[PDB]
Symmetry: D2
């Protein structure tokens, strides 16, 4: 996997984010997701890889573009790709927090090829955090005690993040009961998980259930940033079990370590769409010296080098023209 | 009003914010609000003013501390004090975005002494924006068209902010219909209004109904930053009309210009509690060089100088100790 | 020239900067310059170009690249070998790329330069044959400011004294760098640099490089080559230059599709230098600060990169 | 010493820096020094202290304003004042790096009343640095070995800062010989020393001879930030010895520990004039949203709380008017 592909992936997430931003707060989820899918597919087909989507918009049944198995790329090293063209159920359409475009790449077989089902997740940051510090089968209380001990802080210092959902009431109650502070995001548990390993995020732990593709993407990031994570797939009906069986998953209650989610040489890239607790959103800027432009804020990382690059890009644009020109 | 008082106010908002943060995401809206009231009252009694609370926690009936008419301060120039010990009590409770501590000061008579009623609000930023660019009795479409022409952008470039509430459904649709992007905040229309005048917020217009104290405080900020705002109090019951004559307000359908909400020599200060559209929240930091501390982010502005100060403060703290040590 | 090449170029400047930093302030010109060169050549040979060095072991005419579109390469493995070696300000690693024939193929001679930033600056706003006063008056009018607000930048050198005197006399503020007129020129177009204008004589390679950047960021510049010795004249003639007194517009220095990349080695008026950082969460790393830009898209990318490293190991492990 | 004086001091250093900036690069060190002195004097007399200048512009013989012994302030707690209206008059006059305006306050007697003589200095940052880590009679190599051990790094990682002067050749050579990296500043060893305790300075150790007033000022900062320093006055002729006996100093070869230079409850404030390796300089800014303004960057800190505040101030201004209007 050539060292060039890392920086080429940022451009993909950037184009996808600018497309999404044209639809931000337009109250049309479908238009936002389609802008992002279109931009991200068109841009991947300019990347020099022999890519196979292993995590994408769905099965070829359901999704015309970026479907499982889709081959993408102009040609190059053989890589498996994990994609989230636009993170968020409604975030972008309402202008909510933590909207993101996400892309990861691994050597063939480097990702758990997750169906879109729910996944329980627990994650903590820290390059020196040891395996076993978090376990999904331990109580919230014991995981938090171990985290607090390793970080050297009183329990009330710890900021636990989870999604505002009824399914998380118990996590919330138990964490508050043992003294921690528990903040709630409305969506976007890729940002929520990775925040545990980002400087100055104000987030120490992530506990919650969210999308499985998002779990894998976040594990990719933390593979690069340092941290520990445990996840478990959840199945609501028999068709989800069939999807897993077709992907090779038969131990349905397997606990995946972070190394089982993403292994080997990993590249992870994301661009912000709206402001979130990982990356800021796209912004319109006017400057006399340099004119008007959109600003995107992105991050690309690589597990083998451990290199992390934060990127602020200025894309020239005459904002007298319609914003949908940012679509591809 | 001495030049000393401006910088002194930021210490008040900082202490109120640290107190509030100790309660962030504890799910106890009362405990947060009173942590912040108690820190702020103690901190104000060390400020060198002869201050009278004209906007506060309520009337002496309902509020033991920071009630209307309360005298505060160690002694000094006579000023009216408009405060919000915690803008976003529920916010802070769930660690949502846009929670703030806020304090403003004017010479005697400088604020609209707003009762606790609702208030229609429209705001735009820009230090060259003309009086009349926005008006509450015009349609959304005509206001946005004037704003778009004044900023020199296509309508789809504009980002309108409003609170996610049934009462704004019509603003939202109308703004979307005429081509603008409309983003929704869950709470915190002080931040929402002030974002319009803050560099790189990504918010161009605020349109909404919220708390009247909040609109006076936001108007105070905008008087310092540059912008235009129009507001009107709403009275739903006879009791609200009674609070108004008790504060001396009798012209119920008055539309207030920004000069009618905050006039003369105005100081505005605020500190972030959580991350928001205006300020970053409090963060725990560890460094080998200096040890561990809480970092706060604050702004303090004065209208006569137009001086705006961005303040990042590092407050030493051993986080092996209980976070409630930050209280009072 | 394919929209990859821009993001590939930053990696070249980043690697050369880490290598240069390992030699920072060590007092060894040669060891710095050979760390930088070695890393830049190795990184460039991973870039997908048929590159030919036209300005700049990395000798003029050297072919570099793994293979691709045909491009002219202007390079400064270490702009400020002296600079990195004494730990001075404004040490940068730099790379620019243009389509074939896009750069003035400048001999390594001195060059008079004047430059101002701004996307709407009309050509002729600066001209080397106008007085310093009239240049500055036109610039102050264009920026909408009183003359006393202008900050003019030049190098602290005897040859610049008349510039300095005249600019002060007409009321401007005139600041002096000790070297690094790549960064000095490009600061006129770098926001918040506090530099409005650059006037002075410096290396012609360095002038081409700055022109490539301003072509991307917006601004104007004029230059003229200076020949003090017969050898320099011969070296121009062998490059095809025979109008020794030509004034060059910015477009004559760098034209067409251009990519410019740089990474700071020491802190300077354009970029911060490389820093050792420790964090409890992330561990320890060197931070680089880079910029890369392209004239056809006018896309500008600011890049802060964290390179994980155990600083109990020798710093020369950042060499290539 | 009330907490109110800390934030009042920043305004002083801001006013002096703006006045200095009006003279930056004008080639007239006199006019710069005088604009700074005038501004600092006037602003000081608005601060609520009973202040005595113990370090200032000179003796009443040579300096009409801010002379040793001068009383300053509007009235308040009694403090000794150590002033540098303009650290870097020559710096400012050429537009060089590391010009600062500086103000430090302490309880009566808490500064070394430094004479205008040269001072050998060595300094390192870090709150856990033990007294004795640096000593002027140990070799440069042994100081650097202890410092590398304390920072937990290979010697080759250390960055040593000194000034580019003949008198420092042996420092430079020895640091290079034992494997360290050595960066050179042309002037401004207040900033050079304080950078050792400043985040992201890239400077680990300061070693060199410079001004003794400047040594005291930097020691005050390091008492607030964490670090260790040693200093020794040096004397090149009788007039210099007389300067010391006039201030009561008779042990001419005393090695001063940091606690001998500044002790007790210290407030340190500084505003950058030019960009340096501790603070950024004053900049002209034009915003479409906010209009045009001068931005100053300051820091204020206190030794007893260890609170540090970083302050970015935007001073509204029409730059069509002459820059000398920033004078006082
Ligand atoms: O320049 P010298 O005479 O060699 O001594 C250095 C001392 O003077 C300074 O360089 C300040 O000089 P200026 O205020 O005139 O610029 C200090 O930073 C330093 O303390
Ligand atoms: Mn998605
Ligand atoms: Mn409130
Ligand atoms: Mn060179
Ligand atoms: Mn001075």
């Amino acid at each position: 996997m050539n060292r060039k592909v890392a920086l080429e992936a940022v451009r993909v997430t950037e184009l996808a984010a600018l497309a999404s931003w044209s639809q931000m707060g337009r109250g049309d989820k479908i238009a936002a997701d389609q802008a992002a899918v279109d931009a991200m597919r068109k841009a991947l087909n300019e990347v020099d890889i022999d890519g196979t989507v292993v995590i994408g918009e769905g099965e070829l049944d359901e999704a015309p573009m970026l479907y499982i198995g889709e081959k993408v790329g102009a040609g190059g090293c053989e890589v498996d790709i994990a994609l989230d063209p636009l993170e968020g159920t409604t975030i972008t359409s309402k202008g909510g927090a933590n909207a993101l475009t996400v892309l990861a790449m691994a050597d063939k077989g480097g990702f758990l090829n997750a169906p879109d089902v729910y996944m329980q997740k627990i994650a903590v940051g820290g390059i020196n955090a040891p395996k076993g510090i978090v376990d999904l089968d331990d109580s919230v209380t014991n995981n938090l005690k171990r985290i607090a001990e390793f970080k050297g802080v009183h329990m009330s210092a710890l900021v636990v993040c989870t999604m505002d959902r009824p399914r998380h009431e118990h996590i919330i109650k138990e964490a508050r009961e043992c003294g921690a502070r528990v903040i709630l995001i409305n969506d976007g548990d890729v940002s929520g998980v990775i925040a545990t390993a980002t400087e100055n995020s104000g987030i120490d732990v992530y506990i919650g259930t969210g999308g499985a593709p998002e779990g894998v993407l976040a594990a990719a990031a933390l593979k690069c940033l340092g941290g520990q994570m445990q996840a478990r797939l959840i199945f609501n009906d028999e068709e989800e079990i069939k999807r897993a069986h077709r992907l090779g998953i038969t131990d349905l209650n397997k606990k995946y370590d972070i190394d089982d989610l993403a292994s080997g040489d990993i590249v992870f890239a994301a661009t912000g769409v709206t402001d979130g607790n990982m990356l800021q959103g796209v912004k319109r800027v006017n400057s006399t010296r340099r004119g008007s432009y959109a600003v995107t804020h992105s991050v690309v990382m690589r597990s083998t080098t451990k290199t992390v690059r934060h990127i602020t890009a200025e894309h020239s644009f005459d904002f007298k023209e319609g914003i949908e020109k940012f679509m591809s």
